[PDB]
Design a protein around this ligand. Structure first.
Ligand SMILES: Nc1ncnc2c1ncn2[C@@H]1O[C@H](COP(=O)(O)OP(=O)(O)OP(=O)(O)O)[C@@H](O)[C@H]1O
Ligand SMILES: Nc1ncnc2c1ncn2[C@@H]1O[C@H](COP(=O)(O)OP(=O)(O)OP(=O)(O)O)[C@@H](O)[C@H]1O
Ligand SMILES: [Mg+2]
Ligand SMILES: [Mg+2]
Length: 1152
């Protein structure tokens, strides 16, 4: 529906209560989120931004995006900014009322308490006004940021779809995804904070024009302190930059680890790799600890500023022999606000302004790319003809001309309507370039073209949009049943479409993942045929088709349906060329022949942004069980927390005794500033950070030990990308951000609790006033979290549609440019962006409501405490002032405390998953199988079921079968890689009676895909450090690795960087065979040695196996006829059955 509300409801955010109620009661769905108002429609934002951007481009000599952006959206920005400034002015000014109240209570004046209470009610009204004029302005600024982001995304999508063809191969997909990823939160949330660029200077000017002029020492200290904070900021980036290189090196080791869990389990390498990963983590831990230490010093310096910033301000005026407590209390209340405005607000505003300007400049720079210029095709006679065509891909050579290499030179031809052509050439000859220049994507430097306009495209690359078969074929045109039936019958895709349960509206995903290459190609041909045009362009139409189907499809459709319509074909076959009318051949970017035979014969696709939807969906947030598990894992962490609590309580007790009981007048500062009174020093908080780092290291080590040495069925139940995502993101969050968030939350809760306790001790009525306030805080936070977490999760799940649409549009850019479905793609992109905008808008609205209500509750607490304290007829001069100051300066710390309280739960939502993966479960030589059965996962397809066979010692077994029949599954079942029931006895012992560890070592196998890691040859041969140089040399000599060792510059220590691709397939097979010879096993297992092998390495492998394992049993797997001469026994897998034969010549009797 459409939201609508009155002025009071708009100001107090009372219209978000229905969705809070629904989310609290039950799980939120995509249906309950109401429709965005028309103000924030993607189409409206795009139109409004373009109407100014095009005018700016047409008028301004120097183009800058901010020039149009200001005349677009600056007015409301300033309108919200003035409200923000007037709200902050009240916070700046309110301590004057505090000082006057203190003067009223002090025995200097005889004025009754009536004036004091008349001022206190005004102070509370001032807080109410400041809240009411602060929070809605922040929400409005967030709204402005929303419109900003939506308009920017729409315009940049329009540009990236209108891109020129030349810059497409300047591959910057990573740059584009980074641009659309890193900006969404930064340019949206930061706009509200961006307005403090002049608010802080105006506030400090007001503060120091309202303090008696002396007081400049406070500015001198803050200026040094502000520069000091930036001084440690550079150190942070110095350590982070250094460590970022090492985490990349360690991560790729884990990435290569998941892809070969089978090989790792077979080789029993869990301990060595565990030690290697532990060593790498130990190396990175020092840098992480240094970064955490400097962050702690920065935070502690900020917290300890509070005392010195007033101390160094009062001492210049303390030499004048007298300070009234009213003056010191009011200068404390002024200096806290001054510090808040100087040390944090101004640097944050400057940094966010710089980041926003950089992002806008980068977006403009990308947008200023050269456009795609289409050409009218109204030139008559509707025939394809060119003359003197010169083509240059790069603009520099295109505008100069033979300085650069061309791709088409001096090509001429002319074909009447109905005649079909054929182009043949080598790979990269330029057939695709000729197609592009015919289309108009490539601009010809020389040569005028006159031909028809209606064109059709079937690209080399298969592209399918996320729709259905009918939509993929017709592209929204009127559904012609006769044409559709004719095209499906001609393309012979009916036999494929009718196999599915769905017949007419089969829905596909992105990129046609459901189908295969042949189906995608035939769908592309069907689309090309269906597209009504007088010039059909094809680019390798049958690249993924078989020979028979490719031969049949030509005479079925091409010269039967559009035989009277002109088309251009890409082919290299004599029959197609013979049927073709005129012929063109391209060589080295130049045409080779023109005429007839009458003359001739006479870096990731499924990115983490897309995997996050399936990764974060299992959070199910969190419970206190994970809190307890995370807090009790390490003893020293508990001891340090206990020590911190004891120190806090001791400091509170000392302050209490001091208040119960010369420089005394300058001693009240320490107690009067809870920020410096209860902040943890460098001797009581550094062990906390150290313990957090140790907890992170222990959790990572246990997670590695759990993911490794785990049942393969359960491990394969999850995907490799998903299991790697944890080590990529969750460990980094738990190690870097989590300790800092934990420390900040602990400190901000400790200061607030100490302030409340001491205030209650000075006045016991405030103790009973606080309990309802605390329970209200807790209840309201619990109420808000349930809806907030669900809304954030839904928004995160809704992020990936935008990027999937982006990649889908990019993959088929040429097809979209040829077909003119730009409006359809724009409206679909806007449809997705509207849902994402609605999610983010509701999240922002509920966050603003939460902040409003917590501030209102604190205001109620403040009025209660202040009125009760001022009305009570207390004794002493300090008590009233100190209580008022403490209860007045808390709110700034309380906001950060509650923000950290929500953020710590948001972060620990990840240690929840980490603990779940901690909690995942864990587990001659003759053979005789007894009813073997296994499957990839429980409930899967039992490839092997009720299997019984035996192998004689000192023999060989040859295994033959089609691909995918289950040979790999049988080898895994032998290896105990998968869950199995039954037994196989090696001379009498099965899996059950002996340890699986020694079971694995008794075997030996090379995988279908060999495994190698980024390590030296010595480490890849002997990861366990159980071998010596002489025996390694002996193994290398026996297997024949001397040439392999000497061929590389590093003698036996050449590092295998980037997956060890230096070795060939045969070299890798020799490597793993030598490794198996090292791991001495009485039995050997084999799996397809000749997938991409050459005869010399094949025969050397045969020689090595014959010489090394002549007296064992080898289960060889190969389909070659010549290979099967050395297999005394035979075995075949034919659809879940096994037949063992004494010879192969009798097998040929069955299947000659
Ligand atoms: N947009 C482009 N910008 C720059 N170079 C390009 C672009 N498109 C293609 N090329 C390159 O120009 C050359 C022309 O090759 P083209 O693909 O046109 O020939 P082909 O024989 O049809 O190719 P294929 O081997 O893909 O069947 C190739 O080296 C190709 O990589
Ligand atoms: N990781 C996996 N998860 C789920 N199913 C799988 C997995 N790997 C393979 N399969 C299933 O097993 C089939 C292939 O079985 P497998 O590779 O073990 O037999 P094969 O005859 O040795 O294969 P090939 O000779 O093609 O390597 C696949 O088509 C699929 O149905
Ligand atoms: Mg090509
Ligand atoms: Mg296989």
């Amino acid at each position: 529906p459409l939201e609508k509300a009155s002025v009071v409801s708009k100001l107090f955010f009372s219209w978000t209560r229905p969705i809070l109620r629904k989310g609290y009661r039950q799980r939120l769905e995509l249906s309950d989120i109401y429709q965005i108002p028309s103000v924030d429609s993607a189409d409206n934002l795009s139109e409004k931004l373009e109407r100014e951007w095009d005018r700016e481009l047409a008028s301004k000599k120097n183009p800058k995006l901010i020039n149009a952006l200001r005349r677009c959206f600056f007015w409301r920005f300033m309108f919200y900014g003035i409200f923000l400034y007037l709200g902050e002015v009240t916070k700046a000014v309110q301590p004057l009322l505090l000082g006057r109240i203190i003067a009223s209570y002090d025995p200097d004046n005889k004025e009754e308490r009536s004036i004091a209470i008349y001022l206190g009610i005004g102070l509370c009204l001032l807080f109410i006004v400041r809240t009411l004029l602060l929070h809605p302005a922040i929400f409005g600024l967030h709204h402005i940021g929303m419109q900003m982001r939506i308009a920017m995304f729409s315009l940049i999508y329009k540009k990236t779809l209108k891109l020129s063809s030349r810059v497409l191969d300047k591959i910057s997909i990573g740059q584009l995804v980074s641009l659309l990823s890193n900006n969404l939160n930064k340019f949206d949330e930061g706009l509200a904070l961006a307005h403090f660029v002049w608010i802080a200077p105006l506030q400090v000017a007001l503060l120091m024009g309202l303090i008696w002029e002396s007081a400049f020492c406070g500015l001198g200290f803050l200026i040094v302190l502000a520069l000091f904070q930036a001084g440690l900021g550079r150190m942070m980036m110095k350590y982070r930059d250094q460590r970022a290189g090492k985490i990349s090196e360690r991560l790729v080791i884990t990435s290569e680890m998941i892809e070969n869990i089978q090989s790792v389990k077979a080789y029993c390498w869990e301990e060595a790799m565990e030690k290697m990963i532990e060593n790498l983590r130990q190396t990175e831990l020092k840098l992480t600890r240094k970064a955490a230490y400097v962050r702690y010093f920065n935070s502690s310096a900020f917290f300890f500023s509070g005392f010195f910033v007033v101390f160094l301000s009062v001492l210049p005026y303390a030499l004048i022999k007298g300070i009234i407590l009213r003056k010191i209390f009011t200068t404390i209340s002024f200096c806290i606000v001054l510090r808040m405005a100087v040390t944090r607000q101004f640097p944050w505003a400057v940094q966010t302004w710089y980041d926003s300007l950089g992002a806008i400049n980068k977006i403009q720079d990308f947008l200023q790319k050269q456009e795609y210029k289409t050409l009218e095709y109204n030139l008559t006679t509707t025939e394809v003809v060119m003359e003197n065509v010169t083509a240059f891909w790069e603009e520099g050579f295109g505008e100069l001309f033979l300085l650069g290499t061309p791709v088409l030179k001096d090509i001429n031809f002319k074909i009447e309507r109905g005649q079909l052509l054929a182009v043949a050439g080598s790979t990269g000859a330029g057939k695709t370039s000729l197609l592009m220049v015919i289309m108009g994507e490539l601009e010809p430097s020389e040569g005028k073209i006159k031909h028809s306009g209606r064109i059709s495209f079937c690209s080399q690359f298969s592209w399918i949009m996320p729709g259905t078969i009918k939509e993929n074929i017709i592209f929204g045109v009127s559904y012609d049943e006769y044409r559709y039936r004719s095209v499906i019958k001609a393309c012979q895709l009916e036999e494929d479409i009718s196999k599915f349960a769905e017949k007419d509206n089969i829905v596909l995903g992105e990129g046609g993942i459901t189908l295969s290459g042949g189906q995608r190609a035939r769908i592309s041909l069907a689309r090309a045929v269906y597209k009504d045009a007088d010039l059909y362009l094809l680019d390798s139409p049958f690249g993924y088709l078989d020979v028979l189907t490719e031969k049949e499809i030509f005479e079925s459709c091409v010269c039967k349906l559009m035989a009277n319509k002109t088309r251009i074909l890409v082919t290299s076959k004599m029959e197609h060329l013979k049927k073709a009318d005129k012929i063109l051949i391209l060589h080295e970017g130049s045409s080779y022949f023109y005429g007839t035979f009458s003359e001739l014969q006479n870096x990731x696709x499924x990115x983490x942004x897309x995997x996050x939807x399936x990764x974060x969906x299992x959070x199910x947030x969190t419970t206190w069980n994970t809190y307890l598990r995370y807090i009790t894992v390490h003893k020293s962490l508990i001891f340090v927390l206990i020590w911190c609590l004891v120190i806090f309580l001791a400091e509170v007790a000392a302050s209490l005794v001091v208040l119960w009981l010369s420089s005394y007048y300058v001693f009240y500062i320490y107690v009067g500033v809870a920020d410096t009174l209860l902040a943890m020093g460098f001797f009581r908080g550094l062990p906390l950070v150290h313990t957090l780092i140790t907890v992170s290291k222990i959790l990572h080590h246990k997670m590695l030990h759990s993911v490794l040495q785990a049942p393969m069925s359960t491990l394969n139940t999850l995907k490799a990308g998903g299991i790697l995502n944890r080590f990529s993101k969750d460990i980094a969050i738990l190690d870097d951000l989590l300790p800092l968030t934990i420390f900040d939350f602990i400190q901000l809760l400790l200061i607030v609790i100490g302030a409340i306790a001491v205030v209650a001790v000075l006045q016991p009525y405030i103790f009973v006033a606080t309990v309802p306030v605390i329970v209200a805080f807790i209840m309201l936070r619990a109420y808000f979290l349930q809806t907030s977490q669900q809304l954030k999760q839904l928004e995160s799940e809704g992020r990936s549609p935008i990027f999937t649409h982006l990649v889908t549009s990019l993959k088929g850019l040429w097809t979209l440019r040829a077909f003119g479905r730009q409006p359809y793609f724009e409206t679909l992109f806007h449809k997705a962006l509207n849902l994402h905008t609605a999610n983010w808008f509701l999240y922002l609205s509920t966050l603003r409501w939460f902040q409003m209500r917590i501030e209102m509750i604190f205001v109620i607490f403040f009025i209660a405490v202040t009125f009760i304290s001022i009305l009570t007829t207390g004794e002493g001069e300090g008590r009233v002032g100190i209580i008022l100051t403490l209860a007045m300066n808390i709110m700034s710390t309380l906001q950060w405390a509650v923000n950290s309280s929500i953020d710590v739960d948001s972060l620990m939502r990840s240690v929840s998953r980490v603990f779940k993966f901690i909690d995942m479960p864990t587990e001659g030589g003759q053979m005789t199988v007894k009813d073997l059965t296994a499957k990839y996962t429980e409930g899967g397809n039992a490839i092997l079921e009720n299997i019984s066979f035996s192998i004689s010692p000192g023999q060989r077994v040859g295994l033959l079968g089609r691909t995918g029949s289950g040979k790999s599954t049988l080898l895994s079942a032998f290896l105990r890689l998968l869950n199995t029931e039954g037994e196989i006895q090696i001379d009498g012992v099965s899996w059950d009676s002996i340890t699986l560890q020694q079971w694995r070592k008794a075997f030996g196998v090379i995988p279908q895909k060999v495994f190698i890691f980024s390590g030296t040859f010595r480490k890849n041969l002997d990861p366990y450090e159980q071998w010596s140089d002489q025996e390694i040399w002996k193994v290398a000599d026996e297997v024949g690795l001397r040439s392999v060792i000497e061929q590389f510059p590093g003698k036996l220590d050449f590092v295998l960087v980037d997956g060890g691709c230096v070795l060939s397939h045969g070299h890798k097979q020799l490597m793993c065979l030598a490794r198996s010879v090292l791991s001495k096993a009485k039995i050997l297992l084999l799996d397809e040695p000749s997938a991409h092998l050459d005869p010399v390495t094949y025969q050397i492998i045969r020689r090595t196996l014959k010489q090394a394992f002549a007296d064992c049993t080898v289960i060889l797997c190969e389909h070659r006829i010549e290979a099967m001469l050395e297999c005394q026994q035979f075995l075949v897998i034919e659809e879940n059955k096994v037949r063992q034969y004494d010879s192969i010549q009798k097998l040929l009797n069955e299947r000659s």
